[PDB]
Every structure is written in C-alpha cells, then in structure tokens.
Design a protein around this ligand. Sequence first.
Ligand code: HEC
Length: 86
Amino acid sequence: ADSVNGAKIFSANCASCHAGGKNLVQAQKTLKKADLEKYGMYSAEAIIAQVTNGKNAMPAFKGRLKPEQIEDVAAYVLGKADADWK
Ligand code: HEC
C-alpha cells in the first residue's frame, strides 16, 4: 500500500465528511485511532471492506475508486490515525 497516494485519495474523496478525522454525518464514528479500535475498524482489511462496500450512510466506493486506490486510502487512514488523529 502507498499512504502518500492514499492521502491524495483521501483529500479528493473523504474529507467532505472526515476532515480532521471527524465524521460530519455520524458524529461518534470518527477516524481517530481510539474510535477505530473501539469499532473493530483499526486494520487494513476492515477499512478496505467498508470503503469498498459502504456501511449505512458511509458511501461505497467500489467502481468509483480502483482497488489499489482503496487499499492506499486505507493505509492512509491507518497511518494518520496512528500519527495525528489520536
Ligand atoms: C459522507 C458522505 C462520507 C464520506 C464522503 C466518507 N465517509 Fe466514511 N463514514 C461516513 C459515515 C456516516 C460513517 C459511519 C458509518 C456507520 O454507520 O458505522 C463512516 C465511517 C467510516 C469509517 C469507520 C469509522 C469508525 O468506525 O469509527 C471509516 C474507516 C471510513 N468511514 C472511511 C472513509 C474513507 C476512507 C472515505 C473516503 C474514501 C470515507 N470514509 C468517505 C461517512 C462518509
């Protein structure tokens, strides 16, 4: 995975709702490490699944983003949560 490419994908596709690791639609489901851990979402597998297929009001990105781009954005989230958002 490529977290740098991931940051590009995040900026273009995710920051509308998750700027600063928040969640503008469903406020407690943030991208902070502690919340990812709490919800079982602190892994590449988990983030890829949810980005790909969606969850409730979290959009699915299958088709929109290529599989590699989904992998890279997952890497970005994990890295950013580790470094800055928690
Ligand atoms: C609004 C239109 C959103 C956009 C754009 C993106 N996300 Fe999202 N995300 C959104 C919601 C409403 C939710 C909660 C879903 C639920 O009901 O549980 C989410 C959740 C996530 C999570 C998990 C967070 C956690 O459990 O604490 C992740 C990892 C996530 N979203 C990632 C993510 C990425 C990488 C995005 C762009 C490709 C993205 N989201 C866009 C709302 C919206």
